[PDB]
Design a protein around this ligand. Structure first.
Ligand SMILES: CCC(CC)O[C@@H]1C=C(C(=O)O)C[C@H](N)[C@H]1NC(C)=O
Ligand SMILES: CCC(CC)O[C@@H]1C=C(C(=O)O)C[C@H](N)[C@H]1NC(C)=O
Ligand SMILES: CCC(CC)O[C@@H]1C=C(C(=O)O)C[C@H](N)[C@H]1NC(C)=O
Ligand SMILES: CCC(CC)O[C@@H]1C=C(C(=O)O)C[C@H](N)[C@H]1NC(C)=O
Ligand SMILES: *[C@@H]1O[C@H](CO)[C@@H](O)[C@H](O)[C@H]1NC(C)=O
Ligand SMILES: *[C@@H]1O[C@H](CO)[C@@H](O)[C@H](O)[C@H]1NC(C)=O
Ligand SMILES: *[C@@H]1O[C@H](CO)[C@@H](O)[C@H](O)[C@H]1NC(C)=O
Ligand SMILES: *[C@@H]1O[C@H](CO)[C@@H](O)[C@H](O)[C@H]1NC(C)=O
Ligand SMILES: [Ca+2]
Ligand SMILES: [Ca+2]
Ligand SMILES: [Ca+2]
Ligand SMILES: [Ca+2]
Lengths: 389, 389, 389, 389
């Protein structure tokens, strides 16, 4: 029946699965209608995986594709592609209009959710199968917004992180609990709860969820939100490791104070991601990514730890460079592939492609999953935005 | 087994689902074969929803796409796309040749119906699955024609509204009752029955249907046809609300007389639509659309009422503007999404795109469904027909 | 289990289903890779219908599409499209290389068959599902060739007409009996058996098949082959009606002599087709097509009769003009749509498109099926080959 | 449940199934995004066959397609197409990044495997369904690499040949045994085991596998590896026939010595293939291919034998020329089509297309299967690389 977390498939590192690179096909002479997009992620049912992303109602090449830098507009939609299909117009499936997205399969049907509307009164609508079953209005009237990666479903209920409020100040996230797309309750995030953008969430065992988020205002440490789905409680933490995962960030270990001390810098940030190994009882290893550069969104480096990330300031253990530091690397996202015998968690990388400020913007997506003992290879795009017609 | 009406999913307003906008991809440099079309609608089975429309045997860009303003020709066909697939040549599925269309799923198979033939002796053919099972010839020999939106199936029988006769005078609609596509009986529409074009029909409870139509000759009030599927009877009414829903129309409340008084103006019109909330026993709320302009097909405004629309002259209650008044808005259509637990009704909007009189003509389709408490956002196309190559 | 003939759905005429016209999309500015083809036909399983045709390993527009006039080459393949999908490169499915084709579904799997090889030693291969299960070599070493329309399967065995020998002289057809694609026996055609090209075959009741063929050497009357699948016998006849169905042909009734008298002319011909109404016991009405012109492949006119076509010289009864005489019309083909309650037979029309002798050549396909009481409308292409780029 | 080898369908020769030729559609004026590729092969489940190949993250025509000569890069991926779909961007499905590939279906799910990484530390990852279940690191740190044709699954375990080491010297192959994509054991290849590139493997009966490989360093005779899946043993042999199957090669029979004598030449080679007839007990006939030219990769000639190829020096028996000697012919690959009643083995031919050294490179694929009594026809491409835009 319902999807629930299983022990994960054996693995001790991150190794490459595949890469999608639609705009390799958008050069002079090419014959493809490619889909420029941002905020991609992957979510899976037991039958298939899908690449979800937020489009701009346009293909590249084409006259209208100059709007693809925009965050929010009446053009953007949550769309998806079977995982492994390239991102072309005929392969695209439109789910919901809107400009911030999430999706997750509960074992029976897809829940899709986007936020639509003006900045001061946006509305999240949740589609379950083909019907809009849920609606959740803005509570702080300042850009209601959600994860830009998959939500998590356990035992017929799905858990979605939303936030509303100033991106440069205190903004309190909430956990929405859904059943067939209907919002049946809201869980208050206690503890360290003054920020939490764009959370990447994974089950840590049979009944708990852990989310790795972005503090866009206060800290280069990433917020962590843990959800107890049985008690229906959630608590916020600050990631304690000296290996700070956000971008921009100061030098490792240089934030003086306790785990939950913000640090002097902290403005700005980027969506981050993790993967894990777990039994039905507990998570046994975590895998993290951050940029190569401490100031710019470039490169991707993988790390791992067996420590509890909310309590230990120990540096993370280096796995290696997944994307060279000369290569733009923007968002990363967590996702899980469910299996009949074991589950597998993965990290996806938004390798950004752009012609510059307020010009054409899209990406290539590279996927790494928990398997093996060492990193196998780094990824490139070999797309020069100047060559895109 | 058979499809039948269930109580609807909770909702008190109309909120956006998605939008399809194929000709965003028909600009200079684009690589897409887009399908120009008119009279679109949506119909759903328990397995999927589909966007149906009447094409012109041509894609845009292309040399032959200048015929897309035409109402009737030997080129047009009823075609469809999985809902959410963009309207491109490879995504298209052709069902029947013809120039007026309807379709509906009875729980087992699709019934598709079009009218084909010359104006003075056209024939409706009804396809059930892959076979043509039904045929219904013109009875007034003056452009036999049908709904341009989905028909309604209850307990294995489907109900289709057809009309035949002068578009500028008295033309009597008929209800066709079909079983596996075969026309097994005709129901005479009694009462106010001298007009009734392009009806949008929804079940109002377990056994009754209500259709909101266009009086192209006599009144700015919309005809309403109610069908009792158990008794096998149908009766025509005139919508009584001071908030007249057709275009063109006089000022609200200015038609002097009883509910069924036509009014002085009334020539012309546009296909209209409604949505509803219902139990198994009764409809509890209705949602309506009309243009912003009282004279031109521009804009879309949503309204609601808990009154019986055939008896109450009360103004409808404003929900808000779904399409700004500067934006062409032509047909709207009702449709229903069936669910395992509850059904959901929706309104689709044909946002018209054209280069002018007897020039290239098509649309973008925006979908709003019954959910939530307030309208979330208005829709735009951001397509300039001059940019279409 | 196995497919078998049922009584047909009620109908007394031929009315249009749909039309496919891929090269409407092959004009200046268009964005489609259309598939030029010849010898199209349709065959259906209980799950779907498919348009089969013989391609040339090329799309239009394109530099290599000038070979599309050729009958036989190492380029041609039997390919197919879901019925209603337009004939584009991405929608195409390749089944077998070869230059003469047939296919038919037995209730469990598709049998596909083509002839491949040089003119003097060609080989029919039969594919059952995904495997090549059958092989049948040339027996007269002079262009082994088959129906260019669907074969017929009854009770797990399929029946395929092949011929081999001079196209301008005596060439004896054979009936191949297949089981899971393996040729398990050959049935000798007795009686009037000196010709029989490109047969269109339909079941006439639960256990018999009737094929309407082309005599390319001797007569403007069409050969008819009847197969008794229980006895495993087949006999050839000459169609006796004064309404001669081949092209070219003399004036109606002008062939002096008995039913099987050839007549003075008879050289050349075109593939023809019929449809029918039947019970489980007997065929009750037949529907026929021929060109408008008695000398050129132009136009299509439908006729009907309740007489036995092998014995009665009565003229056929006019139904009407399906394709105007100014419009090229080449092959026609019979096919059957199986249903859960009743079966339906249809005629497809190859509306030919060409730039001239040994230049680009393809078609549009129009489908008419047995339903209703009168012909609804004629078909056009509105494709000017000069406009194809 | 699990896939296992059945007796093969009756057949005594090789006859053509079909051909895929995507770059016929990559000429001036064409509208297709074709996928240039190398190292193609086919593998089948009981539900469908698929054409697998290694792409270059690019379509033709397009600015980036000049890298398609490369063996190994961060661009290449194992991709596939339903067998019979042409090789276009929208039809493509990406499975794994990497630059050497294999795949095989065990009756329940696909196992896909590629090697990814730098030459000195590459890693094979094995994907089972949607999850990466297996990982196998380089053991000789010199281009770990695999078959470039399908692996073989028997009774829930799959068998994959890998090799690692110098391509111009001794390199020891290993048999990987997988279960749901996890590498559960390695089988040591005993006997003549100093080489064995790019093996084409088929079951020879219910429990044994035979692989025909390429010795790139020592001999124009092809290595043969036999696997006993019950004992879990594998042994290497040298093909003994005077009809040497590799390219380049000396004159037939001119290698003096025993079966396992290398011969004086032997440097270089090409992937080869075979097909067979078998019962559940034993293989009864084998079918082989080699080039027409003894020095260049051109043409394809089929042969057959009933001798044991590891012990008999008898010349093989000529079947005939499948690809003329003037036509480039590069890799060939074995594959099997499973059936409900019988299995069928086939040979695929990579008919190479290239603009020259370190320029655009791809292919057409022709398929021949075991059926009939004589070769039916040879294959051509009719693609001139100079015409590709
Ligand atoms: C609105 C604040 C939010 C901070 C997490 O901005 C995000 C930053 C983005 C970024 O830093 O690249 C892109 C996101 N599209 C944007 N989200 C929305 C809903 O606009
Ligand atoms: C024929 C009268 C009918 C009035 C409802 O005209 C409709 C008006 C149209 C319109 O007002 O835009 C477009 C419809 N395509 C047309 N229907 C047909 C069958 O031609
Ligand atoms: C070979 C004789 C046969 C007469 C029925 O020619 C057919 C005539 C054709 C025609 O008259 O248009 C086209 C067919 N493609 C051709 N068949 C083959 C196999 O070449
Ligand atoms: C690396 C040695 C191997 C010899 C079998 O080279 C192969 C030769 C090739 C060839 O001879 O055409 C092409 C293969 N793409 C290549 N394989 C890899 C993994 O690069
Ligand atoms: C999951 O982990 C949480 C946190 O440690 C723990 O409280 C809970 O009991 C665990 N659940 C199970 C089923 O072991
Ligand atoms: C549906 O509504 C009609 C009209 O009010 C009513 O007559 C009928 O009884 C209702 N049906 C059911 C099943 O309640
Ligand atoms: C079908 O028709 C043939 C020819 O008239 C006849 O001999 C046969 O008995 C019929 N079959 C059945 C099942 O009635
Ligand atoms: C398959 O062949 C091998 C080699 O000859 C033989 O040892 C084995 O017994 C055979 N298997 C079966 C099931 O006959
Ligand atoms: Ca930060
Ligand atoms: Ca009116
Ligand atoms: Ca003739
Ligand atoms: Ca060699």
């Amino acid at each position: 029946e319902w999807r629930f977390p299983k022990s994960t498939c054996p693995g001790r590192s991150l190794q490459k699965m595949l890469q999608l690179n639609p705009h390799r096909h958008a050069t002079a002479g090419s014959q493809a209608a490619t889909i420029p997009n941002r905020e991609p992620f992957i979510s899976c049912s037991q039958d298939e995986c899908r690449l979800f992303t937020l489009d701009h109602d346009v293909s590249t090449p084409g006259a209208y594709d100059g709007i693809t830098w925009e965050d929010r507009s009446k053009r953007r939609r949550l769309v998806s592609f079977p995982l492994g299909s390239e991102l072309t117009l005929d392969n695209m499936k439109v789910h919901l209009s809107g400009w911030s997205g999430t999706a997750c399969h509960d074992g029976k049907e897809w829940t899709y959710a986007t936020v639509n509307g003006p900045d001061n009164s946006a509305v999240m609508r949740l589609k379950y199968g083909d019907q809009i079953r849920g609606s959740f209005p803005s509570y702080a009237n300042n850009i209601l917004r959600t994860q830009e990666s998959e939500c998590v479903c356990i035992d017929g209920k799905c858990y979605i992180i939303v936030i509303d409020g100033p991106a440069g100040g205190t903004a309190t996230p909430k956990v929405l609990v859904t059943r067939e797309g209907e919002v049946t309750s809201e869980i208050i995030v206690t503890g360290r709860n003054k920020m939490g953008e764009e959370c990447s969430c994974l089950a840590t065992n049979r009944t708990w969820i852990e989310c790795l988020c972005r503090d866009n205002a206060f800290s280069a440490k990433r917020p962590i939100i843990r959800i107890d789905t049985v008690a229906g409680t959630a608590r916020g933490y600050l990631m304690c490791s000296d290996t700070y995962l956000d971008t921009p960030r100061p030098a490792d270990g240089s934030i003086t104070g306790s785990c939950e001390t913000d640090g002097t810098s902290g403005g700005g940030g980027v969506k981050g991601a993790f993967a894990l190994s777990r039994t039905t009882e507990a998570t046994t290893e975590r895998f993290y990514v951050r940029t190569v550069s401490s100031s710019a969104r470039s490169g991707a480096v993988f790390y791992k730890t067996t420590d509890d990330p909310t309590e230990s300031n120990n540096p993370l253990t280096l796995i290696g460079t997944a994307v060279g530091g000369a290569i733009p690397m923007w968002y990363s996202f967590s996702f899980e592939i469910p299996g009949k015998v074991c589950d597998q968690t993965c990290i996806g990388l938004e390798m950004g492609l752009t012609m510059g400020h307020q010009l054409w913007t899209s990406n290539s997506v590279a996927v790494y999953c928990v398997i093996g003992d060492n990193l196998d290879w780094d990824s490139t795009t070999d797309v020069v935005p100047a060559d895109i017609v």
